Amino acid sequence: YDIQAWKKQCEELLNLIFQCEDSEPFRQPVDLLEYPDYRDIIDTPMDFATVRETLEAGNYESPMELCKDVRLIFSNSKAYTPSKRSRIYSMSLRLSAFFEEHISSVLSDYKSALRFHKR
């Protein structure tokens, strides 16, 4: 029932994601010189360094907010891909599966702890 435990759990999950070769295209903001039309397609860029920095700054109140930003990394990849068979999009799907597998208990434990706090 630790209401704060999600933060270190998210830090550790972000460390695992950074060790994953599949996270390479998503570790830093998409380079607009490499993809000049990116902002014509994507309204809200997101990447894992921005997620880690937001967390470290104390700018996430809950793991649900962090999860919304990580899911935005994957929806941006899906929206920008010219093909469902592209290399970067394919990496995003594996990384998303790994992220969802690991974030589930973090969310469950946090929501359970908050329900206990307000019991």
Ligand X SMILES: O=c1cc(Br)ccn1CCO
What's the N-to-C CA distance of the chain in angstroms? 12
CA gap 96, 93 in Å, rounded: 5
DSSP letter at 23? G
State which residue, 9 or 96, has the beta carbon closest to ligand X: 96
Q: Is 70 in the site for ligand X (CB under 6 A)?
A: no
Query: Applying CB under 6 A, which of residues 3, 5, 20, 88 lies at the interface with ligand X?
Result: 88
CA gap 75, 81 in Å, rounded: 10
Q: Which residues contact 117 (CB under 8 A, 6 or more apart)?
A: 1, 3
Query: Applying CB under 6 A, which of residues 6, 77, 95, 99 lies at the interface with ligand X?
Result: 77
Residue with tokens 């270190």: 8
State which residue, 69 or 109, has the beta carbon closest to ligand X: 69
State which residue, 16 or 29, has the beta carbon closest to ligand X: 29
Q: Is 106 in the site for ligand X (CB under 6 A)?
A: no
Query: Applying CB under 6 A, which of residues 6, 89, 99, 110 lies at the interface with ligand X?
Result: 89
Contact residues toward ligand X (CB under 6 A) are: 25, 30, 35, 76-77, 80-81, 86, 88-89
